[PDB]
Structure formats: structure tokens, C-alpha cells
Write an enzyme that holds these catalytic residues in place. Sequence first.
Site, mmCIF file in Angstrom:
data_model
loop_
_atom_site.group_PDB
_atom_site.id
_atom_site.type_symbol
_atom_site.label_atom_id
_atom_site.label_comp_id
_atom_site.label_asym_id
_atom_site.label_seq_id
_atom_site.Cartn_x
_atom_site.Cartn_y
_atom_site.Cartn_z
ATOM 1 N N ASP A 83 -11.953 4.700 13.023
ATOM 2 C CA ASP A 83 -12.471 4.382 11.564
ATOM 3 C C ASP A 83 -11.810 3.455 10.751
ATOM 4 O OD1 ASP A 83 -14.129 7.035 12.282
ATOM 5 O OD2 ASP A 83 -11.954 7.881 12.152
ATOM 6 N N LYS A 93 0.763 -1.223 -0.046
ATOM 7 C CA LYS A 93 0.053 -0.129 -0.054
ATOM 8 C C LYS A 93 0.887 1.250 0.040
ATOM 9 C CE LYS A 93 -3.709 2.473 2.294
ATOM 10 N NZ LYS A 93 -4.689 2.554 3.732
HETATM 11 N N1 LIG Z 1 -7.122 -7.864 -1.798
HETATM 12 C C1 LIG Z 1 -6.946 -6.998 -0.819
HETATM 13 N N2 LIG Z 1 -7.608 -5.646 -0.819
HETATM 14 C C2 LIG Z 1 -7.417 -4.795 -0.067
HETATM 15 C C3 LIG Z 1 -6.668 -5.178 1.147
HETATM 16 N N3 LIG Z 1 -6.779 -4.154 1.903
HETATM 17 C C4 LIG Z 1 -7.332 -3.168 1.495
HETATM 18 N N4 LIG Z 1 -7.884 -3.536 0.268
HETATM 19 C C5 LIG Z 1 -8.648 -2.636 -0.801
HETATM 20 O O1 LIG Z 1 -8.048 -1.345 -0.540
HETATM 21 C C6 LIG Z 1 -9.325 -0.616 -0.541
HETATM 22 C C7 LIG Z 1 -9.148 0.144 0.832
HETATM 23 O O2 LIG Z 1 -8.015 0.658 1.152
HETATM 24 P P1 LIG Z 1 -7.514 2.067 0.136
HETATM 25 O O3 LIG Z 1 -6.220 1.931 -0.568
HETATM 26 O O4 LIG Z 1 -8.558 2.816 -0.202
HETATM 27 O O5 LIG Z 1 -6.947 3.034 1.603
HETATM 28 C C8 LIG Z 1 -10.484 -1.114 -0.842
HETATM 29 O O6 LIG Z 1 -10.679 -1.221 -2.342
HETATM 30 C C9 LIG Z 1 -10.150 -2.491 -0.443
HETATM 31 O O7 LIG Z 1 -10.762 -3.532 -1.036
HETATM 32 C C10 LIG Z 1 -6.267 -6.546 1.233
HETATM 33 O O8 LIG Z 1 -5.432 -6.871 2.224
HETATM 34 N N5 LIG Z 1 -6.073 -7.356 0.165
#
Ligand SMILES: Nc1nc2c(ncn2[C@@H]2O[C@H](COP(=O)(O)O)[C@@H](O)[C@H]2O)c(=O)[nH]1
Lengths: 303, 318
Positions: free
Chosen positions: B238, B110
Site C-alpha cells: 500500500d 514525518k
Molecule cells: N514535499 C514532500 N511531501 C511529502 C513527502 N512525502 C509525503 N509527502 C506528503 O505527505 C502526505 C502523505 O503522507 P502522510 O503524512 O499523509 O502519511 C501527502 O500530502 C504528500 O504529498 C515528501 O518527501 N516531500
Amino acid sequence: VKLFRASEPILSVLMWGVNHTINELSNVPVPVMLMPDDFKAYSKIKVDNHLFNKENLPSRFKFKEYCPMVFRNLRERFGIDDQDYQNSVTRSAPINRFLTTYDRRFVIKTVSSEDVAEMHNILKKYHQFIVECHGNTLLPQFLGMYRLTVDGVETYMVVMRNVFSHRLTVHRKYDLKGSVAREASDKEKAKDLPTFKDNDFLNEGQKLHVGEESKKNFLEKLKRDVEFLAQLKIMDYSLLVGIHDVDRAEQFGPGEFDPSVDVYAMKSHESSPKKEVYFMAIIDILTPEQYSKRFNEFMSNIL
Amino acid sequence: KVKLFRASEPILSVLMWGVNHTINELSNVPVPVMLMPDDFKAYSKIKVDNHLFNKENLPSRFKFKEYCPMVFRNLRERFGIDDQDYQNSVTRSAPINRFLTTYDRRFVIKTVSSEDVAEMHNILKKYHQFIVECHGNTLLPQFLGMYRLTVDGVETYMVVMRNVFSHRLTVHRKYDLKGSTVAREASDKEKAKDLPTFKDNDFLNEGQKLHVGEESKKNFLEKLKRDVEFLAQLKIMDYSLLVGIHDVDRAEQEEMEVEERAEDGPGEFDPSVDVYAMKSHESSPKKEVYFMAIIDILTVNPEQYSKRFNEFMSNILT
Ligand SMILES: Nc1nc2c(ncn2[C@@H]2O[C@H](COP(=O)(O)O)[C@@H](O)[C@H]2O)c(=O)[nH]1
Ligand SMILES: Nc1nc2c(ncn2[C@@H]2O[C@H](COP(=O)(O)O)[C@@H](O)[C@H]2O)c(=O)[nH]1
Ligand SMILES: Nc1nc2c(ncn2[C@@H]2O[C@H](COP(=O)(O)O)[C@@H](O)[C@H]2O)c(=O)[nH]1
Ligand SMILES: Nc1nc2c(ncn2[C@@H]2O[C@H](COP(=O)(O)O)[C@@H](O)[C@H]2O)c(=O)[nH]1
Ligand SMILES: Nc1nc2c(ncn2[C@@H]2O[C@H](COP(=O)(O)O)[C@@H](O)[C@H]2O)c(=O)[nH]1
């Protein structure tokens, strides 16, 4: 698991550095040919570790490798595997500037800024010559060139194949130029391994008995070398000669060696007095006709 | 065995290069008996200037920073992840999607902010302790690395964690649940996506339910309890419960249509790999696999958020 433990932080950086660049290169494809830019190229890495990995290594340091593609190619043309080169530098601190890897295979010489410039200066031609002579030459075999930065201080190093055996002991060293008149100093004349010179040699009557077999190859080699050094308008280089006395050794057998590892070693002849192993290579070339020609003869005499 | 670090974007090559670099280095570093407090303020930083060399995939000039490497190594260990595996997952081939997956779907990468990295440092000592005393059994994000990359003088922060989802199983539906009293629903924009991210109100509208059966429900609710309480201790709010549903039969058919198409092991997983996965009760309607994890941990106050969060997630399954 390599700690890079050495008696001195420069040496740890060196070990770390050689380890890092060889690994790096192992992910670099071997090209179909070297290119002119490879002769002006370098890798630079700056390390800044906060509160991490301090045991042997400085926390901040720089390591630079000159022309890594050319030197990797030279290693190959000299019959040297990159992983062995790496192992030799890193498995254990090099030992006593003029160092040696722990296994005595490679010499590690500190040199100057101008030295490194001189090297860049001759490197394409030196490479081309190495190609043309299929690696067979008395010239120094340059394996890598590096700059280290430690405590704000830059240090240049060139790594070479060791002239002498790596497992055989030497009982004589004679630095030979062939001109004038050169002798060993009082201060030095009484060291364990005296560096004798031309006159000290002739005034001993010392000859080297390799036959006419070994002499034919050796002399043919010598001339093409010094001719190359001359065409480069280089001079003041010596012929380093080491002499190993077999019998004295007895006081995995004696005289035994691997010609592919001790590349400069030469067996004494059948029809010869004492039984020995000689080591003969051209050293100190980083700096004309008259010097070459003369040096070529004086050398073709003792033999 | 050559690794080119070939990738669609230089940032990604640098990431691959950096994880690869830092893991090898770490391999020449003894495993300590214990972590020390400095280990929690430590970092490694490498800066590369290559000139006319090694320019095919990597930039000539970049920086890689690893935060608190000794801690993250130990975290990897406590999550039963071998460094070689981690390295391979990241380096054998480019991550794909900011939000990336390793080419093999084991790990998530991320892109986060400077604030996020800051918050990670705040909580790092306590999080490690909390991972030690739950033996790695948690619905929380399992952190494996934190990095700062620099390319074209631009800084990019990344955290590596374990994938909430299976690396083999397909997900057919997912929700982001908070339990908030506010309205939370999938936009019209979202609903038309391939795999929409449904929310609190969608899950309730659908009458959805998750049939895990009693032995699993308890073990889950017990994890959730310490996890949210821990998050409560820290200022954290949150965060959400990511819920992925995998339809066993639907996957079997999809597979079938995958071979026939090319022409021109039965809803199970390794619980040591798919760590958040739960089978459906042997008495569920359709046969299913669920994945459920807490994510995003970097009027209402945390304690009450946790409490809310808790009661909702508890009514989600059966
Ligand atoms: N496949 C997968 N998707 C994730 C994971 N953590 C967050 N997401 C995806 O990332 C998004 C949420 O985190 P964001 O990047 O918006 O902060 C959502 O689209 C969610 O489905 C994960 O551990 N595995
Ligand atoms: N053992 C060993 N000594 C060398 C080798 N090359 C040069 N030397 C010695 O090391 C000394 C240091 O280099 P110089 O003093 O000539 O700058 C030389 O004078 C020479 O006696 C080598 O390959 N092996
Ligand atoms: N609490 C804490 N925050 C840090 C530490 N190192 C970096 N940060 C924070 O992480 C972000 C990025 O730091 P940078 O590594 O880019 O200097 C900034 O918000 C910075 O303050 C640390 O050791 N402790
Ligand atoms: N780069 C860096 N930033 C820090 C460090 N320590 C704290 N910070 C930043 O300064 C902020 C205030 O520090 P705090 O008051 O939370 O201890 C942190 O949230 C973080 O953004 C540090 O050691 N290095
Ligand atoms: N549920 C289910 N649907 C199938 C099966 N075989 C084919 N279908 C569905 O029937 C349609 C035709 O599939 P096709 O036979 O053309 O592959 C497709 O929508 C396919 O998904 C099956 O075994 N089970």
C-alpha cells in the site's frame, strides 16, 4: 575528536560533562546581570545509552551543574575563556581526591554534600566580592561546581584555578595558618613534596623577598580577603605557599612565566639572596575575627 | 554562532536541540569499518532537567531518544549527506509545515506511530543492505534519522528522510499513485486546496503523461523493479509513487512576478541533491521537471501489489 578516555569512569563522565555544559552554554546568551534565581539554578542531564558509545563512557550516568550562569560569569571575571576551560578538562584525562587538568591549569577537587551547601551559602556574596575587587584576590577562584552520578554513586566536584604555576616546578610547600603550633608529621616529612606548616617554616628562618612593591599589593589584597572571609564568619583556611628554585631548575627559560596564566606567581626581589618564584593564595575556605586578624599578621611576617 | 532553538512549539525546539546534540556527540565517535548487529538494536537516550536555567526556548524538562544512531549515520553517508549539513538544515532555523520540512526544504520530518518505528526496526537490517548494494540509488524513502521526543510526558516519534521534491524547484501539481483496481480520486474537499493531492483516477482522466525520454525511463524502471521486489520480499504493501510536476516556464513567470512585487538555473537541478528529479525529453511539449519516489512503506498480496504498482508506474511515463 574527543574520546573522553580517562583512567577511571568518574573522570570520563567529568570530561564528557564539562564538554557538554560548556557547549550548551555557548548557546546561552550572556545576560546583562545575574539574577537571584541563577543562584538557585542547575542543569541536570541523565544519559542512558543502549549498545552505543561504551568504549570510554559508562552507558548510564548523571551529570549535574550547579548555577551555570554564575560560574560562567566567574570564569569571565577571572579572565578565563570558556573554550580554554573546556579544552583543559577534555583534551586529555585530568591527572593525579585532588586532580589537575592535563595542563596543570585547573585543580579539580572532590568535596562533600555540605561543602556544596556551604558554597551555595556564600555564592552571592562571593560573587559580589569578585565583582567589587575586579577579580584581583587571593581567595580561591571557583570555576565550576558539579555533581556526578556513576554506578548509583554521587560525587561532588569543585573546579578551581591552580595556585601553583602550571609549567614551573615547586620545590617547597608550606600550609600556613598562624596559630597554638603546627608541624609536619614524620610519615609526611619524608615525602617528595613535603607539606610543611607554620612552625616548620619559622624554624627555618624562611623569608620571601618580593620587595616592598609586591608586598604592598599582596598585603592590601590579603586583608580585604580575610576581612571578607571574617564578615562571612568563616575560618580554618590556610595560606598555601609554593617556592620554585630557579637554579635547581637548570639542573622557554628559567624563572620565566606568564602572569596572566600563573595568577599567583611573584618574582623574587633584586636585593634578595636566592633567585626564586613564589606562589601564594588562600586555600580551604568551605566550612572568626580572631582567626582573620591573627592569620593576617603571621602572614605579613614571613614577608 | 549561537543557536536558540526558537520555534512555534516546544516539540520543535526539542527536535532541533536533539538533532544538534546527537550529531555533536556522534562527531566524537570514530567511523567504524563496518556496522555490527548490535548497532541495529542500539539507541541513545538523554534526559534533561533544567531548573531556573535555559528556559526561553526549550522546556526545562524533556527526553530525546535516537534509534540505532550508528546505522543512520552510515545511511546519511551512503546518501551523500554530510552530518554538519544535516545538523544545519535542522537547527539553523525551525522546520516549517504532522509533516515538516527543514527551513531549507532539504529534509522532511514525518511524525509516525509506535507501530511505524517498530516496522522500521523489522526492516532496518535488510534496508541497509539493500542501500549498500544499490549504492544509494533508489526510488525508496531515504532514511536519515529516527527519534522519540518526550515533552510534557507525551511521546512523539519522528523519522527524518530526504525530500522527494526539489528544495529549490516549485511543484505545480502532484499525484499519489497506487495502481489499485479500486477507485482512487481527489475528494471535492481536496480539489479546492492550493496544491491538491490528485490520485490514480485523476492522473488517468487528465490524459497526463510524463516525457522523460528513453535513457531516463530505463534507469527509472530499473530502480522501480528492485525497489518494489524488495518491498515485496518484506511484507510491505500500500505504498505509493509520489509524483511532483514542476512547470519550467510557469516558474519563470512566477519568479518575475516575485521581483516586481517586492520592487515596491533554467529548469535544472543538482542530481546529487534533487535525487528523484528528471528533466523532460528534449522533445516534450512544455518544458518540465518531474520528481518521482516511492513513499509510505510503513485479496491482494505484496507480490501482486508490487506487480500492479509496477505496470502502472511503467505506463505513467514515456
Ligand atoms: N514535499 C514532500 N511531501 C511529502 C513527502 N512525502 C509525503 N509527502 C506528503 O505527505 C502526505 C502523505 O503522507 P502522510 O503524512 O499523509 O502519511 C501527502 O500530502 C504528500 O504529498 C515528501 O518527501 N516531500
Ligand atoms: N598543586 C596544588 N596543590 C594544592 C592546591 N590547593 C591545595 N593544594 C594541596 O592539596 C591538598 C589537598 O587538599 P586538603 O588536603 O587541604 O583538603 C592541600 O592540603 C594542599 O596541600 C593547588 O591549587 N595546587
Ligand atoms: N523490532 C524492534 N522494535 C523496537 C525496538 N525498540 C523499540 N521498538 C518498538 O518501537 C516502538 C517504540 O519503542 P520505544 O522506543 O518507545 O520503547 C514500539 O512499538 C517498540 O516495540 C527494537 O529494538 N526492535
Ligand atoms: N521496545 C522494544 N520493543 C521491541 C523490541 N523488540 C521487539 N519489539 C516489539 O515487539 C514486537 C514483536 O517482536 P517481533 O516478534 O516482531 O520480533 C515488535 O514488532 C516490536 O513492536 C525491543 O528490543 N525493544
Ligand atoms: N504566460 C505569461 N503570462 C504573463 C506574462 N506576463 C504576465 N503574464 C500574465 O498576465 C497577467 C498580468 O500580469 P501582470 O502583467 O499584471 O504582471 C498575469 O496573469 C500574468 O500572470 C508572461 O510573460 N508570460
